Design a binder for this molecule. Structure first.
Ligand SMILES: *[C@@H]1O[C@H](CO)[C@@H](O)[C@H](O)[C@H]1NC(C)=O
Ligand SMILES: *[C@@H]1O[C@H](CO)[C@@H](O)[C@H](O)[C@H]1NC(C)=O
Ligand SMILES: *[C@@H]1O[C@H](CO)[C@@H](O)[C@H](O)[C@H]1NC(C)=O
Ligand SMILES: *[C@@H]1O[C@H](CO)[C@@H](O)[C@H](O)[C@H]1NC(C)=O
Ligand SMILES: *[C@@H]1O[C@H](CO)[C@@H](O)[C@H](O)[C@H]1NC(C)=O
Ligand SMILES: *[C@@H]1O[C@H](CO)[C@@H](O)[C@H](O)[C@H]1NC(C)=O
Lengths: 49, 187, 310, 320, 49, 44
């Protein structure tokens, strides 16, 4: 579904927009070289101290 | 230990840092993404809006200040006087004179777009070349020096933490003398 | 001679190289718009009672008189606190190992406790005020005025200063069109050039040097120890700009002026000024403080001699 | 350095264990060896035929002497125009290592100037003399007057109470000012001791106090050779082309250098090793380091899938 | 960086996290992929990114 | 004749300048090193 439903089923060409990279997404299509270092994080309330 | 920690605490409340309590950076995206309390305005149909229109990343500030267009700068002075505004792009020495008027009006340190101010003129004219030569003749001498001495150059601690301390110690003395009356009348 | 000798005498088209602008240069050719704010400047080598305790001083003395009167009233109502409470009470401000007496009155000891807590808290506030005075940055600076009485004659004060420029320059013509006597004093104190006066200011072989302001700012942002400091920020100075001289009748002049206005109004000139300027140079015990305390101490010796002779 | 000494020794560490995990993944064999020189590799002009060629790791890989360069490959545009690459396993930037680590008496009396000590000593001597003179002209006596002058100053007279109270208040306000300015000096003792990234005009034209260098034949030199505002800095760097980074560490430790351009996490690990190293704060050129690969090969698909399998699980945290 | 209050700093900078990247997903067999990768290395390797 | 073993207290109590003042002899012994220790207290 979404961009994977558009690109893998060839209704689209490629995803210029942002997309997380994992195993089966790299199985179905071919990602380019990375251009930005986007990991994960946890946001909390973190009040005053 | 208690009085040393208290002394360093009272020395620690007044540690003056760089200004980040209010937004000072011109390249801050909080200027590009304002809020309900980020009230920045400009003069209606000014050269600042033209300088914004010359660039392309200025549509958000235009759509914010289209409801903030001011006719005169005195309207902006009265609005920042009643704490309605939060930022205003304006010339340097006029705000220096306004800071000489009132101490709460404080400018920032980022001096941007150090431009030149002349006289609005017509096309090629016999009242153009000699007039520009007279501008140069008035600039080479100190004709603007005393004019800066009139209003530009001429402007017009223990005191902060002493009043409530004095009142509290006076109230403590008033209570303590009456407690002394109680202790003497008890004996 | 020079670029004026080349452009005016029809051997050069235009002077893209920078040059100061004055009257006769604007008479012989036509400059461009000023693209940069480059004025002139002069490079040099380079208490705690009245501004701090002025209105708190009166109320603290009033509180001292009130506490002393209460102590005298308790000492006379309920062992030298008849009229000698001033020395005892102002020793209770500091508590510098002064054995005075044993107060048998409970009210006097309660006042000692409250006054000791108060002494701790305004001592903490006074240390905080000393830190707050340390927060701002200050240095010793002379008068910035171009009409200085030092400039009339350096015999007015004990060091005779010295100042020169580069020879045959437009700054010299700006001086001679303003003060030819200043040129007469500069003629006795001449020098060779830019780097020669630079070495003279680094080694201390020169006091003052009149030059363009922005180049001195660029050299003072990279100054060894940031010792060489300009005078002001172009307040009693020329505060002019730089233009591009074209011949009188050049058709390229309006296009060059509009190109410079396009260069300024898009941050590209701001990018070049970011690339080609510097701003790192921003803007030990104190000596005058114990000097003023020594003046107050001489007044204290005077008052003690007055109280001793009577 | 060495005429001919190539011996079998033991190699281990981070990328060695990475290769162990890769050999755990796919069924293959290998041969661990080292590059001959100590240089990364630049496309420098060879002396004949006027041709820019490679050397070092790429000089051995393109000649067929190497199969797979297992190294923190500085992925750039030029090397991708000749060979194919892999997934960047490392996400690492650039920073500047300097020397801001100078040990400290805190200026008490021997580094501190001797105005106050001799001044208060002679002043309390004058105080003791005039208190004894007032003790003579009354409107162990000398020792009593001197020890009274000490005990006022120690901080723990009918017509002489004014002199004593002024001296006591003076002594306390002087020691309070001395406490305040010593504390305010040692709190605010952080001067300008850094470079603030590439945006430094002093490094555009350095001096004898600004000695910076780089690794000889590095990809950072190529990245600087692309940009036009760096070759002037190369005029300071061409005279100090260092072979290895350990030589740069030895030079900057003996104060023969002042700044070094290097990757961030390696310098952070060395700062964990050597406590006398603090880098700058501005991180620039956040790059990706991958594995040197050959052209179109069937050992490009499953190898990159194994790299992604290493990225997705907590094995990167295990390598951390 | 655009937060109202400026009181939200997460745990580290991706130390105990995934720390991955983003790329451009092209279809398996696109001839544009090498040119797009060279364009990305051009855009990153000059400070333009 | 009463501060034989309490001299440790005589150096140890004035550290925080609110102790009981002990009668010191006139034999040029106590007050000099007491002022030295008090100056050291001003340092630390
Ligand atoms: C400017 O002044 C001159 C005389 O100094 C004369 O030609 C005329 O008044 C003016 N000419 C121009 C070009 O404006
Ligand atoms: C330039 O100044 C020097 C003195 O420094 C003088 O000797 C020389 O004549 C001047 N040049 C001209 C052409 O006036
Ligand atoms: C390496 O070179 C040094 C210096 O010539 C020599 O002392 C050492 O024995 C050599 N080691 C090997 C591996 O041959
Ligand atoms: C696979 O690994 C085994 C060792 O476990 C080895 O003997 C064999 O040659 C390898 N090749 C294959 C694919 O069988
Ligand atoms: C070219 O010759 C020089 C010696 O003249 C030496 O460095 C090496 O043999 C060759 N390599 C280069 C490019 O320096
Ligand atoms: C990947 O897996 C195996 C073992 O690595 C290999 O033989 C195979 O050719 C690869 N898959 C494909 C479809 O190429």
């Amino acid at each position: 579904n979404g961009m994977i439903g558009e690109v893998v089923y060839q209704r689209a060409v490629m995803a210029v927009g942002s997309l997380t990279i994992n195993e089966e997404r790299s199985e179905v299509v071919d990602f380019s070289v990375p251009f930005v270092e986007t990991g994960i994080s946890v946001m909390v309330s973190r009040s005053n101290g | 230990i208690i009085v040393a920690s208290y002394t360093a605490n009272l020395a620690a409340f007044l540690v003056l840092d760089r200004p980040e309590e209010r937004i000072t950076g011109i390249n801050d995206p909080r200027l590009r993404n304002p809020s309900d309390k980020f009230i920045y305005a400009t003069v209606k149909q000014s050269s600042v809006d033209i300088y914004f229109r010359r660039q392309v990343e200025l549509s958000t500030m235009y759509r914010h200040m289209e409801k903030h267009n001011y006719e005169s700068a005195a309207e902006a002075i009265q609005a920042v006087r009643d704490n309605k505004l939060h930022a205003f792009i304006w010339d340097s020495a006029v705000l220096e004179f306004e800071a000489s008027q009132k101490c709460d009006l404080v400018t920032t340190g980022e001096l941007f777009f150090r431009s030149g101010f002349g006289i609005g003129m017509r096309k090629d004219s016999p009242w153009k070349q000699n007039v520009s030569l007279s501008i140069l003749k008035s600039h080479e001498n100190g004709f603007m020096e005393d004019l800066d001495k009139t209003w530009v150059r001429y402007q017009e601690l223990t005191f902060e933490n002493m009043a409530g301390v004095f009142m509290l110690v006076a109230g403590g003395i008033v209570a303590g003398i009456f407690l002394i009356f109680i202790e003497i009348a008890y004996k | 001679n020079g670029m004026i000798g080349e452009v005016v005498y029809q051997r050069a088209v235009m002077a893209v190289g920078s040059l100061t602008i004055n009257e006769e240069r604007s008479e012989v050719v036509d400059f461009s718009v000023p693209f940069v704010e480059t004025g002139i400047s002069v490079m040099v080598s380079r208490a705690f009672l009245e501004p701090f305790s002025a209105s708190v001083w009166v109320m603290m003395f009033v509180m001292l008189l009130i506490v002393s009167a209460i102590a005298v009233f308790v000492f006379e109502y309920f062992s030298f606190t008849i009229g000698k409470a001033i020395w005892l009470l102002w020793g209770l401000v500091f508590n510098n190992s002064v054995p005075v007496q044993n107060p048998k009155g409970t009210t006097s000891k309660i006042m000692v406790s409250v006054w000791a807590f108060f002494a701790v808290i305004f001592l903490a506030s006074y240390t905080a005020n000393l830190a707050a005075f340390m927060i701002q940055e200050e240095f010793v600076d002379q008068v910035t005025g171009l009409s200085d009485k030092k400039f009339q004659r350096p015999h007015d004060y004990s060091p005779p200063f010295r100042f020169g420029t580069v020879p045959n320059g437009s700054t010299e013509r700006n001086i001679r069109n303003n003060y030819p006597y200043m040129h007469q004093y500069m003629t006795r104190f001449n020098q060779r050039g830019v780097e020669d006066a630079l070495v003279s200011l680094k080694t201390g072989k020169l006091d003052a040097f009149i030059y363009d302001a922005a180049v001195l700012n660029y050299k003072a942002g990279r100054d060894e120890g940031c010792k060489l400091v300009t005078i002001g920020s172009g307040y009693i100075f020329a505060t002019t700009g730089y233009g591009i001289a074209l011949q009188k009748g050049s058709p390229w002049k309006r296009q060059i002026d509009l190109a410079l206005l396009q260069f300024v109004g898009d941050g590209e000139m701001e990018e070049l000024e970011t690339l080609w300027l510097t701003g790192i140079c921003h803007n030990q015990l104190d000596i005058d403080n114990m000097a003023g305390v020594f003046y107050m101490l001489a007044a204290a010796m005077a008052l003690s001699l007055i109280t001793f002779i009577w | 350095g060495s005429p001919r000494h190539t011996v079998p020794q033991c190699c281990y560490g981070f990328c060695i264990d990475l290769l162990i995990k890769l050999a755990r993944t796919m069924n293959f064999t290998y041969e661990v060896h080292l590059v001959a020189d100590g240089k990364f590799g630049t496309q420098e002009r060879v002396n004949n035929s006027n041709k820019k060629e490679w050397n070092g790791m790429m000089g051995e890989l393109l000649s067929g002497q190497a199969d797979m360069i297992v190294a923190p490959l500085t992925i750039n545009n030029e090397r991708a125009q000749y060979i194919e690459f892999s997934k960047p396993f490392k996400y690492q930037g650039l920073t500047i290592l300097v020397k801001k680590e100078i040990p400290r008496l805190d200026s008490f009396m021997q580094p501190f100037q001797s105005t106050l000590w001799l001044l208060v000593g002679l002043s309390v001597h004058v105080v003791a003399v005039m208190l004894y003179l007032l003790d003579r002209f009354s409107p162990l006596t000398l020792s009593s007057a001197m020890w009274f002058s000490w005990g006022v100053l120690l901080n723990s007279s009918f017509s002489a109470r004014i002199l004593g109270m002024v001296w006591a208040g003076f002594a306390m306000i002087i020691v309070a000012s001395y406490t305040a300015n010593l504390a305010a000096f040692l709190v605010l003792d952080r001067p300008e001791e850094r470079i603030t990234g590439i945006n430094d005009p002093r490094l555009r034209n350095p001096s004898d106090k600004f000695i910076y260098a780089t690794v000889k034949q590095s990809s950072v030199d190529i990245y600087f050779r692309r940009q036009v505002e760096l070759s002037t800095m190369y005029r300071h760097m061409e005279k100090h082309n260092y072979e290895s980074a350990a030589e740069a560490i030895q030079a900057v430790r003996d104060n023969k250098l002042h700044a070094f351009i290097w990757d961030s996490a390696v310098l952070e690990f060395e700062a964990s090793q050597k406590c006398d190293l603090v880098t700058t704060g501005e991180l620039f050129f956040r790059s990706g380091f991958g594995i040197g690969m050959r052209k179109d090969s069937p050992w490009k698909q499953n190898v990159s899938l194994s790299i992604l399998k290493s990225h997705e699980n907590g094995f990167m945290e295990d390598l951390d």
